[PDB]
Symmetry: D2
Subunit: 166 residues, 4 copies
């Protein structure tokens, strides 16, 4: 004999999930992709191709590059790790790209950096990988153990969570 | 829809005890993972057993089947030892009582309280599997969904594999 | 049976060692004292009284309060957890207080927050506790597995370490 | 002055192995702690043994004594199992060859690779003890310095205590 397929590709675009301390900045910067650290110890049957697109906390040019990389990917199952502050805008933009029509594209990340104690990151990565493999084609946000429709979602700062727009 | 989580012990929950000079099955690790998961939805955890999975009898499996049957929830995650996860999953897949439920078994090759554990990833993956898969019994391990009737644990590889 | 003594008192004055992520700030703040977390699992024979003096990354009034608390303590073995950026100035100020004459006073902390992966904090706390119990009376900085004389020490940003002044 | 660290295994270094379905003595945990300690001074680590301390013979202790004697350094940390740390420390305290050295034995009640371990604190404490104490053999555990000839492990308390 069997060959394990690798149907999921992951793109990383920085965000809180990848933040790490630097002595020079005397605080957090966007560091290496934390999803690579989670998948290293996941004992995967197959593998996951992880490609770093950008390392920002994020411009219109950056958004455009993400659409191109996702659209040019061979895989039909895609996970994009990203900051939560701009996740709805990125997700809605990807939603409007005809070339994504047959792909399941999930955005996720973490409210707490993976490299800070008490982070949601590893759970979110596991949930978002499953989501990207199991959901019908579309663009989704997977956070809080839930799937969100980008056109009907906002980040509620007071809650500290994404919430649906009724 | 509401997820119900049942804990049957196993490697995922193992923790060090001075008295034993080694690992024992401790408190359920899934509770530690979900505490920091910032969940939006309805979830509840129920402790069933703190055995090592090798020590399960026909009667431990019988009791697990009836316990899962007591849950009105249609989405079920059962955390369990990998050594007899296929036997429990096959047993549950044979119970007509459970046929409308999505039941996902998962756990970890390395205890969650040991460095470098698969446990958190596996819990996130299995929670999504329990919510997204059609009714049936499944093993969710290694970033994959296994059909219990067509799966074995391969000790040489340290993974479940298809038959 | 015997009664275990508690000869060490710890005062906390914030600093990098205690920094923790907050969703509201979208970055690090000075959080709860990390030394309390290290001592919780240290399986101490006796105990350590830990008193929080301040939570700053730090004014002249704050420096004065530290001198008062250290001087009024019953214990002759004192550990002050603190930011590294102002540690030499605090240490030199404590050095000039006659009321500290019979006390062993050690300042320490961490170049990386205790709640960030790959932190020096737990090692530094163990080393600094021993230092505060074992050194002769005086004021010291314990970092990098070494004891520094405050009057002959500077923080070298390029090295990322304290270094002696030759 | 230069510290030399010798590793003799024990609980501090235990790690989970799929093949054993449990803990084995693994790679020395002191190396993991010192990697992130941002040390200023001269330190070197030497592996002596990967036994569980219960399994030490008169000959394992003999070999440890001669190995510590091979170090020109006067400041020595030996990481070790707690179950026979008093026997090794008493043995070393009887060797005239070592009488100019400060030799500190330490370890952990909980493996460093298990959550909630004393190991990192104990390593920092013991490094300072090895640098600061007068020549002699000492156990540094529980934020305290023990005289080996006047110490026992109390299994009821889970700590070393004075006699
Ligand atoms: Cl920051
Ligand atoms: Cl074990």
């Amino acid at each position: 004999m069997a060959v394990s397929p690798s149907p999921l590709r992951i793109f990383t675009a920085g965000g809180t999930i990848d933040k790490d301390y630097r002595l020079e900045e005397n605080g957090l910067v966007v560091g290496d992709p934390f999803v690579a650290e989670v998948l290293k110890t996941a004992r995967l049957a197959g593998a996951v191709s992880i490609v770093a697109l950008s390392r920002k906390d994020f411009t219109e040019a950056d958004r455009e590059a993400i659409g191109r990389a996702v659209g040019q990917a061979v895989e039909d199952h895609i996970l994009l790790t990203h900051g939560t502050d701009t996740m709805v805008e990125t997700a809605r933009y990807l939603g409007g790209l005809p070339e994504l029509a047959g792909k399941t594209v999930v955005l996720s990340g973490a409210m707490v950096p993976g490299r800070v104690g008490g982070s949601d990151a590893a759970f979110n990565i596991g949930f978002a990988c499953a989501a990207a493999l199991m959901l019908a084609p579309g663009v989704y946000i997977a956070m809080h153990g839930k799937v969100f429709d980008p056109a009907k979602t906002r980040k509620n700062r007071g809650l500290g969570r994404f919430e649906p727009i009724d």
